Amino acid sequence: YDLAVSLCLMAEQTYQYELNNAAAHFIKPGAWHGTYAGLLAGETLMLN
């Protein structure tokens, strides 16, 4: 999960670089809900 959310924020960073918009925020803080073992993390990240 740490690796793939790093890849997601990497793609978000190049989105902010190409479209000249440094405030574009598609990958929300969350998606690892610790009480349900971080399940549905990849569903939330595919949504983003």
Binding site: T14, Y17, E18, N20
Partner: protein, 145 residues
């Protein structure tokens, strides 16, 4: 030893290294075309032409760097000029590359410094710099709305 012009738009010798400088805000590239066709005017690619009397099988050594605060993802901030005749640093120039070209995404009207520096002013490249007519920059940019 000497220098020429003002700071950030002139020549300067630093030790054994001549550099020629430029400010992109002082070129007014953002007002070459009318503003009705887009405001995000960002550099795609920059290539350098040095019309000098290159000897038989003689190399060029020059680094065109950027001095400023723009992001410029990684080592795309500088190129090395070896051909001297309409080159970037790259071997086989490739627009629509998967990776970012050097200086790609530079906002063409920023208050940055575009410095081209020559190694070896008095050593192996005295004759090249004495025969240098001018320095020519092909600034390729993109006007996007």
């Amino acid at each position: 030893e000497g220098s020429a012009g003002t700071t950030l738009n002139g020549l300067n010798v630093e030790g054994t290294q001549l550099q020629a400088s430029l400010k992109l805000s002082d070129l007014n590239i953002a007002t070459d075309y009318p503003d009705g066709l887009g405001n995000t005017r960002r550099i795609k690619q920059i290539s350098v032409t040095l019309p000098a009397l290159l000897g038989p099988y003689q190399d060029v050594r020059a680094i065109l760097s950027y001095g400023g605060s723009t992001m410029m993802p990684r080592g795309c901030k500088a190129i090395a000029i070896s051909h001297g005749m309409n080159d970037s640093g790259q071997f086989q120039m490739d627009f629509n590359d998967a990776k970012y070209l050097p200086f790609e995404g530079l906002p063409v009207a920023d208050t940055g410094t575009l410095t081209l520096s020559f190694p070896g002013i008095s050593g192996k490249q005295k004759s090249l710099l004495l025969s240098l007519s001018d320095i020519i920059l092909h600034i390729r940019y993109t006007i996007r709305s």
